[PDB]
Amino acid sequence: VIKPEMKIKLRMEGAVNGHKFVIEGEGIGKPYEGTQTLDLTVKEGAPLPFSYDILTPAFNRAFVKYPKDIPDYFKQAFPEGYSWERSMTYEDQGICIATSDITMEGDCFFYKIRFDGTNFPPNGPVMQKKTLKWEPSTEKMYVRDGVLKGDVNMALLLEGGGHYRCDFKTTYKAKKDVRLPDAHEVDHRIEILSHDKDYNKVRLYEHAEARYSMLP
């Protein structure tokens, strides 16, 4: 059902510290190799006054290299699809909430993404654009109340040297009942490959792989 090469089509609509925006995206990836690239274009609210880095993990857990000994909730969830709900709590009280509804027609995945953020200090690294990139991370996947969840301790590298912390809590929900996996981990590496001066056009890439915790 999930093809070796899958195209991506998306629209993100939201607001950060009251600044409304719309970003549409087109891309391609290799679900089985857990790699993807998106070409993102700002359609409304240009120029964005907050760091682009906060948005990137909202722009598909179907793009993960899953070992055969771990059930793949995301690929199994199709053709029907799945949705996700996420809260992103920053160390300085900035907070974002995002939802994504993921569908698929032929060889293309479609996402309708809603993204809202608030309480970012005007002099913080988000609003002042002091974020360089996200550190690679490990998402701990687990089941609660018969539903797939993912927690991740995220960190944005800052100009100057330090880290700026964010806690991600995602809830994943397939459109049909599908085999739920046992607790595992997804390693991630998200990077902006290129961008124009005000991030009106962004080339975004993610490489991710599933595995069990390497503790016996």
Numbering used by the authors: 3 to 61, 65 to 221
In the authors' words:
eCGP123 is a bright green FP engineered for extreme stability, and was developed using a two-step process. Phanta was isolated by expression screening of a library targeting amino acid positions 62/63/65/69 and 191/192/193 in the bright green fluorescent protein eCGP123. Phanta contains the substitutions Gln62Met, Thr69Val and His193Gln.
In contrast, eCGP123T69V underwent very efficient reversible photoswitching (~ 92% photoswitching depth) and had ~ 10 fold increased OFF rate. The chromophores in eCGP123H193Q and eCGP123T69V are essentially coplanar with the 4-hydroxybenzyl ring twisted out of plane relative to the imidazolinone ring by only 4.6° and 1.8°, respectively averaged across all four protomers. In eCGP123T69V and eCGP123 the side chains of His193, Glu215, Glu148, Arg66 and a water (H2O91) form a planar network of hydrogen bonds and salt bridges beneath the chromophore. Although the Thr69Val substitution results in reorientation of the Arg66 side chain in eCGP123T69V, the water (H2O91) changes position maintaining the network of interactions beneath the chromophore observed in eCGP123. The aliphatic side-chain of the valine substitution in eCGP123T69V can no longer hydrogen-bond with the Nε of Arg66 allowing the NNH1/NH2 of Arg66 to extend towards the imidazolinone O2 forming a direct hydrogen bond and a water (H2O144) mediated hydrogen-bond. Closer interaction of the Arg66 side chains with the imidazolinone ring would increase charge stabilisation on the ring. By comparison, eCGP123 contained a single species decaying with a fluorescence lifetime of 2.3 ns whilst eCGP123T69V contained a major and minor species with a fluorescence lifetime of 1.33 ns and 2.62 ns, respectively. It is possible that the chromophore environment of eCGP123T69V can exist in two emissive conformations although the structural data appears to show evidence of single conformation.
